[PDB]
């Protein structure tokens, strides 16, 4: 458990010099003790596979995750939460590589497992819905997409905080779906909603004193890492609309917040 937390810790810092050998060594050490087909081998493989994915070693990552999937199916059951977790990792990997059709069943299997085990209103079920919706969106299957995103947003808002990062992540993902469809106004709304609860977290309820960056942007026109992107998004949208003084406002406010869409997958 401690060994796993340390591997995760170096991987967070992107310090792959340390992360990989330790992992390769724990894998070697574990195989000697209990053989290859063991839950702990699958755990270290899963961690390593994700390090390879962050290094853009996609082929190697896919191999480890399948190997890890095979073991977990063998040692824990075909419908175990750990299996769902590994499928959600393959689906994310295929999706980020544009193999949406291949990812789609993996994501659906994980969802069926997660629902059965964790219950239909669990944040992990929501995480999954967001990935399914975004995977389907990239295939133009918009019919279910909006439903899944709202079901996931409902879960993340009730079960987690309204200031939880997943809430803003799911909102940007649904906004991207709206953008594909030409629903620019509906996306503009979600960007504004995200940027409002963000301001209200720093300097309370919006009145004539505490107005968010976008209200100032619209005024100029007339005359968290998940927030910096939303600022780049609404700035891009205002620019798309030909509202350049409002665009420059947010574009400058994005550069400040850092010190066109991005598909946020949840793992």
């Amino acid at each position: 458990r401690t060994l796993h937390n340390l591997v995760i810790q170096y991987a967070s810092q992107g310090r792959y010099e340390v992360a990989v050998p330790l992992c390769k060594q724990a894998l070697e050490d574990l195989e000697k003790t209990s053989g290859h087909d063991h839950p702990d081998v699958a755990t270290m493989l899963n961690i390593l596979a994700l390090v390879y994915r962050d290094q853009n070693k996609y082929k190697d990552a896919a191999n480890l995750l399948n190997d890890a999937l095979a073991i977990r199916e063998k040692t824990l059951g075909r419908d175990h939460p750990a299996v769902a977790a590994t499928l959600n990792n393959l689906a994310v990997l295929y999706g980020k590589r544009g193999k949406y059709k291949e990812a789609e069943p993996l994501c659906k299997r994980a969802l069926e497992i997660r629902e059965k085990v964790l219950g239909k209103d669990h944040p992990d079920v929501a995480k999954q819905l967001n990935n399914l919706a975004l995977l389907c969106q990239n295939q133009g299957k918009y019919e279910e997409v909006e439903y899944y995103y709202q079901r996931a947003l409902g879960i993340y808002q009730t079960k987690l905080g309204p200031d939880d990062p997943n809430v803003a992540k799911t909102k940007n993902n649904l906004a991207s779906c709206y953008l594909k469809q030409g629903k620019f106004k509906q996306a503009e709304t979600l960007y504004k909603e995200i940027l409002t609860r963000a301001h209200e977290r720093e300097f309370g309820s919006v009145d004539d004193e505490n107005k968010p960056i976008w209200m100032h942007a619209e005024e100029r026109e007339e005359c968290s890492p998940t927030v910096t992107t939303t600022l780049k998004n609404l700035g891009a949208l205002y620019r798309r609309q030909g509202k350049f003084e409002a665009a420059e406002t947010l574009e400058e406010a994005a550069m400040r917040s850092r010190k066109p869409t991005e598909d946020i997958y949840l793992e």
Epitope: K120, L153, G154, T158, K159, P162, Q186, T189, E193, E200
Partner: nanobody, 112 residues
Framework: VQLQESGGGLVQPGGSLRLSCAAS????????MYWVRQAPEKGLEWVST????????YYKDSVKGRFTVSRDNAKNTLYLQMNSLKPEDAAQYYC????????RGQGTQVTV
Amino acid sequence: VQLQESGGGLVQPGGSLRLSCAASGFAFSSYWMYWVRQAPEKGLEWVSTINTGGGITYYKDSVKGRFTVSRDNAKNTLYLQMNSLKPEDAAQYYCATDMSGTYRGQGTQVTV
């Protein structure tokens, strides 16, 4: 978290009712709000969704064009205008912070 439903009653097919949902114990204007229902021997069903503002509203296929979700963030109240009622709609109505009624109150009875 407190959610209290009201606005139910008996009406004739094609009739109208307005559901109210008072809230306290949470930042209401920082939440999306959901309307759910439950017919006697049937399972709990999602009816409507509303954003933090009023800009984004969603409805179950069967209620579309007949129902309208609204909210008064200052009054901390959620509303559901139920016009042109059908007996399919006759159920128990609850307001929640998600589909499948999490944090739902005692609800309000709607008869057709």
